[PDB]
Amino acid sequence: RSASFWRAIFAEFFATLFYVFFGLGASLRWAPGPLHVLQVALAFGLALATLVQAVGHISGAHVNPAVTFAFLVGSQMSLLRAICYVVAQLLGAVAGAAVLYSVTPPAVRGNLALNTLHPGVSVGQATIVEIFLTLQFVLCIFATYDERRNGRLGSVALAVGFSLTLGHLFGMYYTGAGMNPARSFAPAILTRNFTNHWVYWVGPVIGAGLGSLLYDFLLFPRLKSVSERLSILKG
Amino acid sequence: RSASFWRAIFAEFFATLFYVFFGLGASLRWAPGPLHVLQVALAFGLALATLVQAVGHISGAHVNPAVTFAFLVGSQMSLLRAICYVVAQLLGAVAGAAVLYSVTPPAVRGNLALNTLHPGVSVGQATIVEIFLTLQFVLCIFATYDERRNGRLGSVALAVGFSLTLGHLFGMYYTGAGMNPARSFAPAILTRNFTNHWVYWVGPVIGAGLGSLLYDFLLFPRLKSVSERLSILKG
Amino acid sequence: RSASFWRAIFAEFFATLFYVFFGLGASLRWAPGPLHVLQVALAFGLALATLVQAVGHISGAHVNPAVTFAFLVGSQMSLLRAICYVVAQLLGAVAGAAVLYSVTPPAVRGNLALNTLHPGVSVGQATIVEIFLTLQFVLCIFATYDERRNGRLGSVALAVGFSLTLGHLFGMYYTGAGMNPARSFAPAILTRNFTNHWVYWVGPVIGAGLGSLLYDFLLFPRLKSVSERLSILKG
Amino acid sequence: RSASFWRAIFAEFFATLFYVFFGLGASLRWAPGPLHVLQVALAFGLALATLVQAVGHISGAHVNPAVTFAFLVGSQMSLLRAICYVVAQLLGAVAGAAVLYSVTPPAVRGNLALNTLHPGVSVGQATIVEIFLTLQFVLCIFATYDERRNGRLGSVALAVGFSLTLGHLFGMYYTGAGMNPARSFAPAILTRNFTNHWVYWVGPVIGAGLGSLLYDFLLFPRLKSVSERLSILKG
Amino acid sequence: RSASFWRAIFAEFFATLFYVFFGLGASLRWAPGPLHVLQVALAFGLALATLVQAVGHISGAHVNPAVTFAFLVGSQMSLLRAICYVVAQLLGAVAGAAVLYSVTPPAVRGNLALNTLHPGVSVGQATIVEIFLTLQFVLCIFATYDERRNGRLGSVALAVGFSLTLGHLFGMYYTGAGMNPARSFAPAILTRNFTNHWVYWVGPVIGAGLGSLLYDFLLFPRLKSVSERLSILKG
Amino acid sequence: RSASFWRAIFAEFFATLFYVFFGLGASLRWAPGPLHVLQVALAFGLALATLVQAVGHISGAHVNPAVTFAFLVGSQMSLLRAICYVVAQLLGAVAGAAVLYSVTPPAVRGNLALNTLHPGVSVGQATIVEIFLTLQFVLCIFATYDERRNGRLGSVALAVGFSLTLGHLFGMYYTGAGMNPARSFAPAILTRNFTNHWVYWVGPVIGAGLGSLLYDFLLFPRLKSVSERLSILKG
Amino acid sequence: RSASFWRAIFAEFFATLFYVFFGLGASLRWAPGPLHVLQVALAFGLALATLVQAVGHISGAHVNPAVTFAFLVGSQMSLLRAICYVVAQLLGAVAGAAVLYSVTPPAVRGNLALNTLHPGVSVGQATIVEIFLTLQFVLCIFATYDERRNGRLGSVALAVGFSLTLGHLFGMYYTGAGMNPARSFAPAILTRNFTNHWVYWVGPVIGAGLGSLLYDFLLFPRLKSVSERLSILKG
Amino acid sequence: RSASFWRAIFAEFFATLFYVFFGLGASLRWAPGPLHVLQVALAFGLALATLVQAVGHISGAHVNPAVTFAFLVGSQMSLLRAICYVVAQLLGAVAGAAVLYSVTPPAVRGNLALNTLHPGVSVGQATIVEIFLTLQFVLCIFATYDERRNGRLGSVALAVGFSLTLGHLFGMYYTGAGMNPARSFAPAILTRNFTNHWVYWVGPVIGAGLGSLLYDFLLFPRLKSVSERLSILKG
């Protein structure tokens, strides 16, 4: 029972590793002509849509650092397990960024698709955008998993896939698509470049927390015990 | 039981707010090259597809003003509850349009994607187009929710997502994509500009009403009591 | 019971009318720049994907003339009911083509997206292409509806949507996308132009028949009575 | 019972034949302008998504040679049945490549979309890319079919469709999209051209095997008997 | 002295032959993506700019049938010599169209760039456009050659090159670029297709005549003898 | 001698009429894909380059209202003759705009290419841009005509053509290309729309005057009599 | 006097070296989106236009191997001097191709823009195209230099620039632009690849010879002594 | 005579100011779609082509810092006059960069078109490219002005215009177009950013010096006195 908890860490490590490799790989600058924004955005989404199928089955499939905290603040996971996914995700993000670098040609690779802030957009406007991107994403994942609802949501994994597709397509223009610290983290480190890299952690975390609370405190509450459930933290 | 009815108003307010923010945000003029019509259209659809998952679960997820009336004329909702969603939607539409404005750069924003009538297209042709766009959309949402059918419709929420994708892609060319008063409403007000803005209310409302009746009076009727069901209006 | 059979004819009439209006409308020549082939193809698919949800529930949702015959040759429908859908579809196709014409500007409309044979492609090569396009489409729809399989096919209606997306995207290049007589029929008549218009009827019909037999005589047979089932023709 | 096993070989032959015809047909060089990478990639995916619906129902629907071995190494199939699918797939791949050739015009066809290695990319980098492309694809198909999980995966067939869409979109740039020996095989033979054609067999096979083991030995094991199950090989 | 007159006929035959081969060759349908209108237009211009250098030196370099008449009505050439250039030009146009056909692939060639009238544009609007296109072209060539002006016009041959570039770029949209009967003539005959082909002869001839008179009767007259000069017709 | 002065007015009327017809005609909205800015810009230039050849020979060839004043302030023309060209130009501009309207289809024509101010650009920034555009244009035309310099300027008319090409290409982005009141004037009147239309008169006039003085008072002065030359105003 | 002849060899060596470096450098594969054919074609032309100014002044400026022979067959140069330019050109072509290789990134460079024969085009059709491309080019250069004509040809060097622009733009599609053995030679050798490389030598040489004779034996002969002039060969 | 020397400094100041304003202004990031490389490159060329007409007449028109030194090393100018142009050019470059900044919107402006080194290209490869770009440019300007040659070079100013067009088009890809310190200087200072900014000074200066010597010591020497001419330095 103890070791089984560890496999989930692998699912999260491999899932994120693949997530960063395919999507960040999709960004690679070789589009000067068509607006690859349709492509890159579409790539992150299909990457996430599929990972959810292989990974989520085993355990979670969060992949996104900001999204994991959403579940923790969501009150339904151990504080340690939360920390386990974040480190598995960051390392997973870099493991992927590391390989993508080795495989793509010099002229092809630039900063490995480093989240570049849009000329006109200011730092404050960039944060709010990140706030809303994750809020919708988290709100989508939260409902999708919500057992309470049997209904006919259909491909719950595919549902999440498109939800992310929306965030990136839009996010791509304002803040070079973010809504995920892992995504922003790998390019900066694997290419010694840290600038506004914090707005990316700040918006998604606030967004995730905000988006998480919105589903609970309001939208679709847990008709049981709020104070009692918060015991998961103690194990 | 009384207050619970109010949360649904929030679901509709937040859903529409997000709906207008992401899709209208997608339109922003920065495509002069590729035909963003594929993008913008695709954006409104994924935005709607996802909102249906988070919002619909709690209550409705109509988002579209013309679509809400379809349900009311559809005979299965209180007249007051209908009015509650429309105001929640319009305000939600503006709340989103308001934020999108603050975040996008000056050169980027124009009229915040104001539904501009296509050069050649006349006002009459623009209305019929709006009539058909909503009719198909309403007809799709109506069937999707129709409990009667168990079958294997699959991701009912995703189904609605693509249905709207079709309306906008086509709508984008003739009347700068409409089929939703809320979508048309936010840009006009948040950018003091009212022109043909009525064709947008006129076509979608007629379309919604027409599309709603088509599913009932004909297609797939309610094998119970038509006169008896109309009692929901009285509560 | 007698009149109820007639409503199905309406579902097929409205479904096709909408099918031709949205997809053929999507083709309209105003893309000289991006390769609208991605768009037009994508449009026919979403149009079909959605119609299946509203229409199929009530009855069939074939929409495609060649596809209806597939079911008839498929041995599971009355010969008269088959004829009823074809005429409902052709008229539905024209009803849509008629309205699309009235609404689109002169410069916009050309031949209303008349299936133009590709310069190099010969008449024989154009037929085989049509043969394969419908075969896959019919084979997809046949399995989708096959009750025998409970499984987890998921959104059966959405499944059909993409299947058609494939046919049109490919079909668009060789024979200006066909695989549907109704689609080919409306532009030719609503714009007095008949040329190779037969290859379109010939390939899809052969394809549909061929594709239909493949699923039965081989692939997934009906483990019951082949000779007995053929009694549906007599009613 | 003996002959029934043979029909599965047909499902695999027809499925692959169609798979190569539609996707490879989509690649045909006539895009010099838009970045058909979005198209071609999208085509292979919808082609696979749909085949899974018609073919998988009858038996398997692997289509991909490297993917079939994944199931064999996956320990749950007869060694002979595995060999039966590979030959049915290769022949099916060529049967399709053969027809595509006859139908497309001379100027249109080049090498029938022969997997051309990207200028800068070296042979070693091309292999690793192929390794990761198939690993994710196999891992996706493996989970999708995994009975153990009832859940709400939704359209299991559509899920696989997008998963492949990701591999090709990315694969298209580095190694002209591979992740499938059959896809790489048809163009080389139907156009006497063999170069680096081995990297394609090498990466997908390693990837498939690697991806297969990852799901078992780790991720989601078979809580029964590993040594006992390996008896399927003996029949 | 008699035979020398004949060489001029060759200069005109070869000049036009090359003119139609390069420009019409430039039109060939293989641009679906970028707007080759910039290309095709640019091609006709450089083709004309250069021919003027090799051909004009020997004799004339009119190339354009409508332009030759401009000089004849311009009062400064024998009526027979005028007829000699027209037949040399038409044959030259076809000689070029004939070879272009033999060399370009089947899929490439369509109607050999047959002047296709623009969907919306009516026959009357198409004529006026042709009227203005040639008027400016003729007016440009007339001044360029006008000995009277020594000045510093510079590359008189290059001047004419761009003047034509303007006509075609604009002409390309309304009437698939015309302003030259020879250009319109070759595709129609070398591809049995005659439709509105007369508007092309009608507009350029009227335009040429009109443009010719404008330079004389008004703009820059011949300060000598108008009635006396008209004796060139008699030899 | 008196009537001869009048022909110059015709040269200016026809020149401008053609100038507005070809260039404004080039702008017509049908580019959504490629960046017609290269085209439209290129069109105005070739249009001007050629007019200079036919028109300038007879008299002036200013075409641009702001440019005519440059010559008047340039001290070398009668005040009345200056007024004669401006009215001939404005009427000429409209005469052209009038015909362009009648010939282009409804869907094609919008505002007849009305100088639309760029979203972000403010009114003040739009004026300075106009100031610099005309200054360079005037400075170029001034030198070109400057008899004093024999040298080898080459095609003086072609030189002016490209100079204008630069102004429009750049001008097109900030203020929808202006640098010419006539160009800005025709669309506004022929399509009842006056907005910021003054910035266009203000910048080019200031620019022209400023650019004119720069060549005289500084750059290349008139080594004769400044006070004496100013007598041309008195005739 | 003896050594001075040698400097001309340098002018030809440097001219060609630069010619191949800039134009072939322009081809480099990084355009997948816009149709760089406009670019690449335009590049070879400006490269040639300018070289003619620096190089031609000193001696010749042929640059093109096939073009040099045109002058030799043109009867006006020593047989040895002809051989001197060809070797200076080939070496110059490689010297340039060598440096371009060292400077461009791996992923960027492919075959260094190796003249790739167009899919559909056959070897015979590829030769005729090359025949006509050089004929017009040679005919243009021949007239340009022809002292006999004083006239107002204008920028003789610029005239040649555009003439070549035409050949390459057209040539680019059929035979990946050739009309110059040097251009075809450098990529093949600097990238061990020889295929159809002969059609390139065959067409341009035939074309050059043919084009050369056309200007003499016919067009604009040398009204002096044909047999006497052929003495230049003897010195 | 003393003050007259100063006006030349103004011609150089205004010329460069305009040069940087128009060309750098052309670069502004708003092309993501078409390959503005054709545009930006074309802009710098027309900007230079025209300035040469207004400025060169008065004095020089060098505009390019590296080009001025070419003339100084070219032995035909005072050492002080050389220094006067460089400072007039740098200040002129900034004066232009300063205004361009104030006028373009925030979102539009980025780094004001700061010469960004191409991902793959290394610092050494970037220098050689700069070396060759200026060498050809200087060699072109040198010949153009060379009095010795009367001939028919034509529009000497236009000749220089295209020569630069070539350098920038090519230069744009490798080192974001340089070949001019002034061009590279303005963006770095007006946007506190200095990186590899030296390679730009290093390559153009070496190139200019090298290109200058090539025309003298070899190509077309000065058949007079080399040691005597070097006296200009002393005045």
PDB file of N, CA, C and O in Angstrom, chain H residues 90-123:
ATOM      1  N   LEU H  90      24.918  58.715 -37.155  1.00  0.00           N
ATOM      2  CA  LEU H  90      24.509  58.068 -35.916  1.00  0.00           C
ATOM      3  C   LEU H  90      23.408  58.887 -35.251  1.00  0.00           C
ATOM      4  O   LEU H  90      22.374  58.348 -34.854  1.00  0.00           O
ATOM      5  N   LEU H  91      23.622  60.192 -35.141  1.00  0.00           N
ATOM      6  CA  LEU H  91      22.614  61.057 -34.545  1.00  0.00           C
ATOM      7  C   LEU H  91      21.353  61.002 -35.404  1.00  0.00           C
ATOM      8  O   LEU H  91      20.238  60.950 -34.889  1.00  0.00           O
ATOM      9  N   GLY H  92      21.543  61.005 -36.719  1.00  0.00           N
ATOM     10  CA  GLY H  92      20.414  60.946 -37.626  1.00  0.00           C
ATOM     11  C   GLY H  92      19.641  59.655 -37.452  1.00  0.00           C
ATOM     12  O   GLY H  92      18.412  59.642 -37.530  1.00  0.00           O
ATOM     13  N   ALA H  93      20.370  58.568 -37.213  1.00  0.00           N
ATOM     14  CA  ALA H  93      19.770  57.252 -37.022  1.00  0.00           C
ATOM     15  C   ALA H  93      18.902  57.241 -35.774  1.00  0.00           C
ATOM     16  O   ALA H  93      17.793  56.712 -35.779  1.00  0.00           O
ATOM     17  N   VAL H  94      19.422  57.827 -34.702  1.00  0.00           N
ATOM     18  CA  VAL H  94      18.705  57.889 -33.435  1.00  0.00           C
ATOM     19  C   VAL H  94      17.527  58.854 -33.501  1.00  0.00           C
ATOM     20  O   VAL H  94      16.460  58.581 -32.949  1.00  0.00           O
ATOM     21  N   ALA H  95      17.723  59.982 -34.175  1.00  0.00           N
ATOM     22  CA  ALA H  95      16.664  60.974 -34.300  1.00  0.00           C
ATOM     23  C   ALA H  95      15.455  60.289 -34.925  1.00  0.00           C
ATOM     24  O   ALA H  95      14.314  60.531 -34.522  1.00  0.00           O
ATOM     25  N   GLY H  96      15.722  59.436 -35.912  1.00  0.00           N
ATOM     26  CA  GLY H  96      14.663  58.708 -36.581  1.00  0.00           C
ATOM     27  C   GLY H  96      14.071  57.642 -35.681  1.00  0.00           C
ATOM     28  O   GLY H  96      12.855  57.508 -35.578  1.00  0.00           O
ATOM     29  N   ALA H  97      14.937  56.879 -35.023  1.00  0.00           N
ATOM     30  CA  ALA H  97      14.497  55.816 -34.128  1.00  0.00           C
ATOM     31  C   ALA H  97      13.670  56.394 -32.992  1.00  0.00           C
ATOM     32  O   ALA H  97      12.738  55.757 -32.500  1.00  0.00           O
ATOM     33  N   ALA H  98      14.029  57.602 -32.573  1.00  0.00           N
ATOM     34  CA  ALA H  98      13.326  58.278 -31.492  1.00  0.00           C
ATOM     35  C   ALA H  98      11.891  58.584 -31.894  1.00  0.00           C
ATOM     36  O   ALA H  98      10.959  58.284 -31.152  1.00  0.00           O
ATOM     37  N   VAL H  99      11.711  59.158 -33.080  1.00  0.00           N
ATOM     38  CA  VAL H  99      10.373  59.504 -33.551  1.00  0.00           C
ATOM     39  C   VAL H  99       9.528  58.270 -33.857  1.00  0.00           C
ATOM     40  O   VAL H  99       8.344  58.234 -33.530  1.00  0.00           O
ATOM     41  N   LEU H 100      10.130  57.258 -34.471  1.00  0.00           N
ATOM     42  CA  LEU H 100       9.394  56.043 -34.799  1.00  0.00           C
ATOM     43  C   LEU H 100       8.787  55.463 -33.532  1.00  0.00           C
ATOM     44  O   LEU H 100       7.666  54.953 -33.543  1.00  0.00           O
ATOM     45  N   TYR H 101       9.540  55.550 -32.441  1.00  0.00           N
ATOM     46  CA  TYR H 101       9.089  55.027 -31.159  1.00  0.00           C
ATOM     47  C   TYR H 101       7.838  55.740 -30.652  1.00  0.00           C
ATOM     48  O   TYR H 101       6.861  55.107 -30.244  1.00  0.00           O
ATOM     49  N   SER H 102       7.886  57.065 -30.682  1.00  0.00           N
ATOM     50  CA  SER H 102       6.789  57.894 -30.209  1.00  0.00           C
ATOM     51  C   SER H 102       5.491  57.688 -30.979  1.00  0.00           C
ATOM     52  O   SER H 102       4.401  57.774 -30.411  1.00  0.00           O
ATOM     53  N   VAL H 103       5.608  57.409 -32.270  1.00  0.00           N
ATOM     54  CA  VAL H 103       4.439  57.236 -33.116  1.00  0.00           C
ATOM     55  C   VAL H 103       3.797  55.845 -33.163  1.00  0.00           C
ATOM     56  O   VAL H 103       2.579  55.733 -33.277  1.00  0.00           O
ATOM     57  N   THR H 104       4.595  54.787 -33.081  1.00  0.00           N
ATOM     58  CA  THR H 104       4.034  53.438 -33.132  1.00  0.00           C
ATOM     59  C   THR H 104       3.441  53.033 -31.784  1.00  0.00           C
ATOM     60  O   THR H 104       3.981  53.382 -30.733  1.00  0.00           O
ATOM     61  N   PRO H 105       2.312  52.298 -31.798  1.00  0.00           N
ATOM     62  CA  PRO H 105       1.649  51.845 -30.570  1.00  0.00           C
ATOM     63  C   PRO H 105       2.536  50.907 -29.749  1.00  0.00           C
ATOM     64  O   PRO H 105       3.466  50.297 -30.277  1.00  0.00           O
ATOM     65  N   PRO H 106       2.250  50.777 -28.443  1.00  0.00           N
ATOM     66  CA  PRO H 106       3.015  49.916 -27.533  1.00  0.00           C
ATOM     67  C   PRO H 106       3.101  48.463 -28.004  1.00  0.00           C
ATOM     68  O   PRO H 106       4.190  47.906 -28.126  1.00  0.00           O
ATOM     69  N   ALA H 107       1.942  47.860 -28.258  1.00  0.00           N
ATOM     70  CA  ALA H 107       1.868  46.474 -28.709  1.00  0.00           C
ATOM     71  C   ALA H 107       2.624  46.284 -30.015  1.00  0.00           C
ATOM     72  O   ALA H 107       3.218  45.234 -30.253  1.00  0.00           O
ATOM     73  N   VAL H 108       2.593  47.309 -30.860  1.00  0.00           N
ATOM     74  CA  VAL H 108       3.278  47.268 -32.145  1.00  0.00           C
ATOM     75  C   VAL H 108       4.788  47.227 -31.955  1.00  0.00           C
ATOM     76  O   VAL H 108       5.457  46.300 -32.411  1.00  0.00           O
ATOM     77  N   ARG H 109       5.320  48.242 -31.284  1.00  0.00           N
ATOM     78  CA  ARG H 109       6.750  48.320 -31.036  1.00  0.00           C
ATOM     79  C   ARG H 109       7.194  47.191 -30.108  1.00  0.00           C
ATOM     80  O   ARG H 109       6.463  46.790 -29.202  1.00  0.00           O
ATOM     81  N   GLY H 110       8.389  46.671 -30.352  1.00  0.00           N
ATOM     82  CA  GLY H 110       8.919  45.615 -29.514  1.00  0.00           C
ATOM     83  C   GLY H 110      10.243  46.126 -28.999  1.00  0.00           C
ATOM     84  O   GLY H 110      10.348  46.603 -27.870  1.00  0.00           O
ATOM     85  N   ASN H 111      11.257  46.030 -29.848  1.00  0.00           N
ATOM     86  CA  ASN H 111      12.593  46.508 -29.529  1.00  0.00           C
ATOM     87  C   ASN H 111      12.941  47.480 -30.645  1.00  0.00           C
ATOM     88  O   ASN H 111      14.107  47.815 -30.859  1.00  0.00           O
ATOM     89  N   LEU H 112      11.905  47.924 -31.354  1.00  0.00           N
ATOM     90  CA  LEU H 112      12.058  48.853 -32.464  1.00  0.00           C
ATOM     91  C   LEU H 112      12.832  48.193 -33.597  1.00  0.00           C
ATOM     92  O   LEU H 112      13.603  48.848 -34.301  1.00  0.00           O
ATOM     93  N   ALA H 113      12.616  46.889 -33.760  1.00  0.00           N
ATOM     94  CA  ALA H 113      13.270  46.093 -34.796  1.00  0.00           C
ATOM     95  C   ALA H 113      14.758  45.887 -34.522  1.00  0.00           C
ATOM     96  O   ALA H 113      15.592  46.047 -35.414  1.00  0.00           O
ATOM     97  N   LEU H 114      15.083  45.523 -33.285  1.00  0.00           N
ATOM     98  CA  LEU H 114      16.468  45.290 -32.895  1.00  0.00           C
ATOM     99  C   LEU H 114      17.046  44.063 -33.596  1.00  0.00           C
ATOM    100  O   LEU H 114      16.493  42.967 -33.505  1.00  0.00           O
ATOM    101  N   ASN H 115      18.163  44.258 -34.294  1.00  0.00           N
ATOM    102  CA  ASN H 115      18.834  43.178 -35.010  1.00  0.00           C
ATOM    103  C   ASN H 115      18.996  41.958 -34.106  1.00  0.00           C
ATOM    104  O   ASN H 115      19.945  41.881 -33.329  1.00  0.00           O
ATOM    105  N   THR H 116      18.074  41.010 -34.203  1.00  0.00           N
ATOM    106  CA  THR H 116      18.145  39.804 -33.384  1.00  0.00           C
ATOM    107  C   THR H 116      18.895  38.697 -34.133  1.00  0.00           C
ATOM    108  O   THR H 116      18.555  38.366 -35.266  1.00  0.00           O
ATOM    109  N   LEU H 117      19.924  38.139 -33.500  1.00  0.00           N
ATOM    110  CA  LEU H 117      20.719  37.079 -34.111  1.00  0.00           C
ATOM    111  C   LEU H 117      19.872  35.809 -34.246  1.00  0.00           C
ATOM    112  O   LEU H 117      19.170  35.414 -33.317  1.00  0.00           O
ATOM    113  N   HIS H 118      19.950  35.171 -35.405  1.00  0.00           N
ATOM    114  CA  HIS H 118      19.172  33.970 -35.676  1.00  0.00           C
ATOM    115  C   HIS H 118      19.555  32.727 -34.857  1.00  0.00           C
ATOM    116  O   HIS H 118      20.684  32.246 -34.939  1.00  0.00           O
ATOM    117  N   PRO H 119      18.600  32.183 -34.072  1.00  0.00           N
ATOM    118  CA  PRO H 119      18.770  31.003 -33.221  1.00  0.00           C
ATOM    119  C   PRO H 119      20.008  30.155 -33.491  1.00  0.00           C
ATOM    120  O   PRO H 119      20.974  30.155 -32.719  1.00  0.00           O
ATOM    121  N   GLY H 120      19.975  29.436 -34.600  1.00  0.00           N
ATOM    122  CA  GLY H 120      21.094  28.584 -34.956  1.00  0.00           C
ATOM    123  C   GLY H 120      22.398  29.289 -35.290  1.00  0.00           C
ATOM    124  O   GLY H 120      23.463  28.871 -34.835  1.00  0.00           O
ATOM    125  N   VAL H 121      22.336  30.355 -36.080  1.00  0.00           N
ATOM    126  CA  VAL H 121      23.562  31.059 -36.458  1.00  0.00           C
ATOM    127  C   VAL H 121      24.442  31.467 -35.281  1.00  0.00           C
ATOM    128  O   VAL H 121      23.973  32.046 -34.297  1.00  0.00           O
ATOM    129  N   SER H 122      25.732  31.171 -35.403  1.00  0.00           N
ATOM    130  CA  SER H 122      26.696  31.498 -34.364  1.00  0.00           C
ATOM    131  C   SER H 122      27.232  32.901 -34.609  1.00  0.00           C
ATOM    132  O   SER H 122      26.974  33.495 -35.654  1.00  0.00           O
ATOM    133  N   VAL H 123      27.978  33.431 -33.647  1.00  0.00           N
ATOM    134  CA  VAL H 123      28.535  34.773 -33.765  1.00  0.00           C
ATOM    135  C   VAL H 123      29.537  34.917 -34.910  1.00  0.00           C
ATOM    136  O   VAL H 123      29.598  35.961 -35.561  1.00  0.00           O
TER     137      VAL H 123
END
